[PDB]
């Protein structure tokens, strides 16, 4: 019933799945050389929730979405990080702003620009880092 | 009408084209040599089956006729520099049963659309002599 695109990344870590949200309120990405973590605050069915995926490392970067602001694209790199296949660079683009790039490693690029509709949530794999990531797509 | 469109990947040249979403994709023909010259899709929507060709007249053709219950679940390829133009140099379509491609010989910046849940139901992009850019419509299964 859902539209899920991904994942991009490795087979390490544990599977995680935020599910789609009615509204994404804010995102925090922790990154150093690679993407350590992603945290999302979102609202659905009248309730707000915060979910954190990944480890404790990296410098934090946060965006609080404006009213009418939605995620239009995600892009990054799947990298080799000391033998691990993980997310090394990540950017989220909204209808108004660019959030990123964060991370310093490159490898195999991926990009998911949404010409019609929106990125409504995320899924992926994580342990100490973000091993893999994917998106839920919903109509606008 | 609540469509979900992802893309485009490719250059800014060529003229825009858009097949729209289809009820069923019947067949796809890709013409390729060094790069992706053309894509032709036969699809059904509202009791009508039609064929639309995008791109030029070059390259060798290859075709897939979809089986009953067969749907597209992935698209991947390369955005490349071809004599200074930025176009699609390699393309593959993967169904729940078969891999169609890869076609084309040039590499550059890879792109990939793995559909974990749902299907690719149509295409849009830019084209002139070749396929400058490509994108897809998505639907649930």
Residue numbers in the entry:
A (entry chain A): 3 to 142
B (entry chain B): 2 to 142
Copy text verbatim from the article accompanying this structure deposition.
Between the two CBS, as in wild-type (WT) BanLec, Malay BanLec has a tyrosine at position 83 (Y83), but instead of a histidine at position 84 as in WT BanLec, Malay BanLec has a phenylalanine (F84). First, we aligned the structure of WT Malay BanLec to that of WT BanLec. The structures are remarkably similar, with a root-mean-square deviation (RMSD) between all atoms of only 0.517 Å. However, the aromatic rings involved in pi–pi stacking are arranged in a planar (sandwich) conformation in BanLec, whereas they are arranged in an edge-on conformation in Malay BanLec. Malay BanLec treatment resulted in greater BrdU incorporation than did WT BanLec treatment at concentrations up to 10 nM, but less incorporation above that concentration, which may be due to cell death triggered by excessive mitogenic stimulation. These results indicate that Malay BanLec is indeed mitogenic, and highly so as it is even more stimulatory than WT BanLec. Therefore, Malay BanLec, like WT and H84T BanLec, does possess antiviral activity and perhaps has more potent activity against certain strains of HIV than does either WT or H84T BanLec. We would expect Y83 and F84 in Malay BanLec to interact via pi–pi stacking. Thus, although Malay BanLec is quite a different lectin than BanLec with only 63% amino acid identity (differing at 52 of 141 amino acids), it is predicted to have important structural features in common with BanLec that make it a suitable candidate to engineer in a similar fashion, with a view to reducing mitogenicity while retaining antiviral activity.
A BLAST protein sequence alignment search revealed a candidate lectin from Musa acuminata ssp. malaccensis, which we term Malayasian banana lectin (Malay BanLec). Like BanLec, Malay BanLec has a β-prism-I fold characteristic of the jacalin-related lectin family. To assess binding of WT versus F84T to HIV, we conducted surface plasmon resonance analysis to determine the binding times to, and binding avidities for, the gp140 trimer, which is made up of uncleaved ectodomains of the gp160 HIV envelope glycoprotein trimer. The results show that F84T and WT Malay BanLec, which like BanLec exist as dimers with two CBS per monomer, bind with high avidity to the gp140 trimer. That is, we asked whether disruption of pi–pi stacking in a structurally related but distinct (only 63% identical at the amino acid level) jacalin-related lectin, Malaysian banana lectin (Malay BanLec), would reduce mitogenicity of the engineered lectin without abolishing antiviral activity.
